[PDB]
């Protein structure tokens, strides 16, 4: 995270989500239910950074993310760095590529969509445009700007 001396230590086996924009760390913990485990997690919020000034850091021991699970962080922490780690060495390091499909976390801004009252998880087809990402709902088949879907 560009800094040393007074921070959160390193682990042996697991994943470390680094360079998370400030105020996005907690959101990632919620949205993707990351604390919903027995493994040991360590979090640093509003940590000083050389590059970003400040950022969040998530460390999850004995847990790994597929390249696709990594891409799901694309709409929230696109400049993030996901670090794969075994025997204290950064075995792997990857960054979020915006996915072609986003499940479970978003909700169809369409109030008449069938997805809302129902025991189904949301799902959107992702496709880029000049100034944004277009999100198309699997059910309503309506497409919305990621700015509408993401907003409250």
């Amino acid at each position: 995270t560009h800094d040393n001396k007074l921070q959160v230590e390193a682990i042996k086996r697991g994943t470390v989500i680094d360079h998370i924009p400030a105020q996005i760390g907690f959101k990632l913990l919620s949205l993707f239910k990351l604390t919903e485990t027995d493994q040991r997690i360590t979090i640093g919020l509003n940590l000083p950074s050389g590059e970003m000034g400040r950022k969040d850091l998530i460390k999850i021991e004995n847990t790994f993310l597929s390249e696709d699970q990594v891409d799901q962080l694309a709409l929230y922490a696109p400049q993030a760095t996901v670090n794969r780690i075994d025997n204290y060495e950064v075995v792997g390091k990857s960054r979020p590529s915006l996915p072609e499909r986003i499940d479970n976390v978003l909700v169809c801004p369409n109030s008449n969509c069938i997805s809302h009252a129902e025991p189904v998880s949301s799902s959107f087809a992702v496709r880029k445009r000049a100034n944004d990402i277009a999100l198309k709902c699997k059910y309503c088949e309506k497409e919305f700007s990621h700015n509408v879907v993401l907003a409250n």
Binding site: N112, C113, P119
Partner: protein, 310 residues
């Protein structure tokens, strides 16, 4: 086994050009060579969560023309098979244990897509889901067009009325964009213009389209004039008065029409087409409705039979 065997019929977007032709080719066969016992022994559910007399009678007739039994409900419902809260998911999990196929109409978009996720091995045929899809209305439309024009390629198609909210004009445009060299003419006031996303899809495919203010402007070139109903329950009475008077079709407007030109309308027509048009040879909305039986029989037979020897 045919390409459509055991497949759900939810969206026009999911159907290929070949899928379209297969359906139209089977509909022509069944229209000419009825197979009244083909689905004998099959029980089909007619689930109209949203009341729909014309569509339901059309679908149910198709069911019987192939020999199947029918069970169902048309409701204008008070949570039918819910009781203040049962989910559509559970009602489909139940019904899919009863019948061989589910035909459903619902007020919410996506409803049919959700059903396929709970009906197991039972095919789901979408009879309309809110403002999203109405795939069978487009199949019968395309069949009527192919049958009266002999093709779905190189046609001059004018769509008049409420292009903004009409889900059938949106599906018909999308379906026709799967074929080559068609030209579209859109006649609508600005408040009901064909949506930009539809225009973007056409531009993006090399399909030419134009905007015109009256039917007289395109009449001489049009092969299929598709009229759509104005969702008047959306506009101010005054507003609906000004626009109405413009995009109404009278028989005299057809003076310079081509001999093959057909007037289509998913119906009901009420204020859009004057009754003196009915007697002209171009009037083909009733014939189009009658073709919903062959389009729907085809669809049912293809989904329930591995191979048809027609």
């Amino acid at each position: 086994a045919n390409p459509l065997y055991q497949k759900h019929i939810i969206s026009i977007n999911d159907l290929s050009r070949d899928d379209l032709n297969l359906v139209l080719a089977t509909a022509a066969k069944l229209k000419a060579n009825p197979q009244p016992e083909l689905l004998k022994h099959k029980v089909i559910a007619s689930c109209f969560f949203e009341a729909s007399t014309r569509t339901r009678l059309s679908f149910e007739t198709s069911m019987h023309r192939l020999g199947a039994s029918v069970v169902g409900f048309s409701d204008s419902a008070n949570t039918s098979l819910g009781k203040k809260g049962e989910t559509l998911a559970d009602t489909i999990s139940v019904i899919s244990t009863y019948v061989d196929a589910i035909v459903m109409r619902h007020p919410q978009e996506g409803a049919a897509r959700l059903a396929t996720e709970f009906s197991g091995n039972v095919p789901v045929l979408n009879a309309g889901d809110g403002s999203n899809q109405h795939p069978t209305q487009t199949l019968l439309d395309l069949f009527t067009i192919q049958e009266t024009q002999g093709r779905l390629d190189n046609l001059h198609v004018a769509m008049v009325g409420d292009l903004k909210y009409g889900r059938t004009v949106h599906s018909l445009t999308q379906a026709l964009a799967k074929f080559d060299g068609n030209r579209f003419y859109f006649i609508a006031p600005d408040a009901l213009a064909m949506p930009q996303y539809i225009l973007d899809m056409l531009d993006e495919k090399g399909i030419a389209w134009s905007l015109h203010s009256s039917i007289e402007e395109v009449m001489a070139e049009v092969d299929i004039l598709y009229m759509t109903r104005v969702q008047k329950e959306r506009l101010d009475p005054s507003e609906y008065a000004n626009v109405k008077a413009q995009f109404v079709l009278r028989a005299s407007d057809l003076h310079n029409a081509k001999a093959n030109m057909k007037v289509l309308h998913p119906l009901p027509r009420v204020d859009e087409i004057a009754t003196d048009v009915d007697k002209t040879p171009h009037a083909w909305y009733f014939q189009q409705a009658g073709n919903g039986i062959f389009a729907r029989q085809a669809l049912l037979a293809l989904v329930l039979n591995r191979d048809l020897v027609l």
